[PDB]
Curated annotation (Swiss-Prot), chains A, B:
This is Griffithsin. SMART domains: Jacalin. Keywords: Lectin, Mannose-binding. SUPFAM superfamilies: Mannose-binding lectins. Pfam families: Jacalin. Mixed specificity lectin with anti-HIV activity. Binds to HIV envelope glycoproteins, including exterior membrane glycoprotein gp120, and inhibits viral entry into cells. Binding to gp120 is dependent on gp120 being glycosylated, and is inhibited by mannose, glucose and N-acetylglucosamine. Gene3D superfamilies: Jacalin-like lectin domain.
Length: 121, 121
């Protein structure tokens, strides 16, 4: 199943493939914007972009979802916060004391689903 | 440890936060560009950007590395290829029959290392 491997030396400043997040939101999440790439539809309103610093990652996250994503907010290991953006429907689920590695999902006119890959601490 | 959790419904078309890849390479890799975000220096020659289709993932990847990332190639589940780009020093390692979830790492003037997160099948 899920794993990871490292290749190379020890120099450099760290980076993540997950470098920035923005959303379009109304009552739902219309779309998530990952590293500037638009995923979803064009309804709702565009949030400001949250950009991860070096060594910074999502450590806590709350997601309201039904058959779509309703609301997202998160906190990073350096105490910065994004959201809540979205509406009040759906049921809330929370990831606590994690390191988020990736956000995949599924989208149409709205953000239907999010498949969050993370380290649980 | 590593895990993942899905939120939301069952509609829409799938997407990945790992949505495009380019490299800058000479005798090794000067940089990797993930979703248009530049990780590393500006030396070497800039490969074309490989952009993943919906539902497309790296299913096979070969990396040559020493103190630095020296070469990258990969193949996707839709039968498309990327690379090899880079030189032929270092030691080769292959991720075979996988689904790549995320590419993190460390870079400076050059691409020092990659942390590849994936599912092994
Ligand atoms: O988020 C779903 C939906 O919410 C509201 O009704 C409006 O802001 C729409 O633009 C948006 O599409
Ligand atoms: O995104 C909401 C809805 O939008 C479109 O109509 C299609 O992609 C559906 O499959 C999806 O569920
Ligand atoms: O990639 C290693 C190195 O190879 C060559 O000497 C040039 O293309 C450099 O710009 C590059 O950094």
């Amino acid at each position: 199943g899920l794993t990871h491997r490292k290749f190379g030396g020890y120099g450099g400043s760290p980076f993540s493939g997950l470098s920035s997040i923005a959303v379009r939101s109304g009552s739902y999440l219309d779309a998530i914007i990952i590293d500037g790439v638009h995923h979803g539809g064009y309804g709702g309103n565009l949030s400001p972009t949250f950009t991860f610093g070096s060594g910074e990652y999502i450590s806590n996250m709350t997601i309201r979802s039904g058959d779509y994503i309703d609301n997202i907010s998160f906190e990073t290991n350096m105490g910065r916060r994004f959201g809540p953006y979205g509406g009040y429907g759906g049921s809330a689920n929370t990831l606590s004391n994690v390191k988020v590695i990736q956000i995949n999902g599924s989208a149409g006119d709205y953000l239907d689903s999010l498949d969050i890959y993370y380290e649980q601490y």
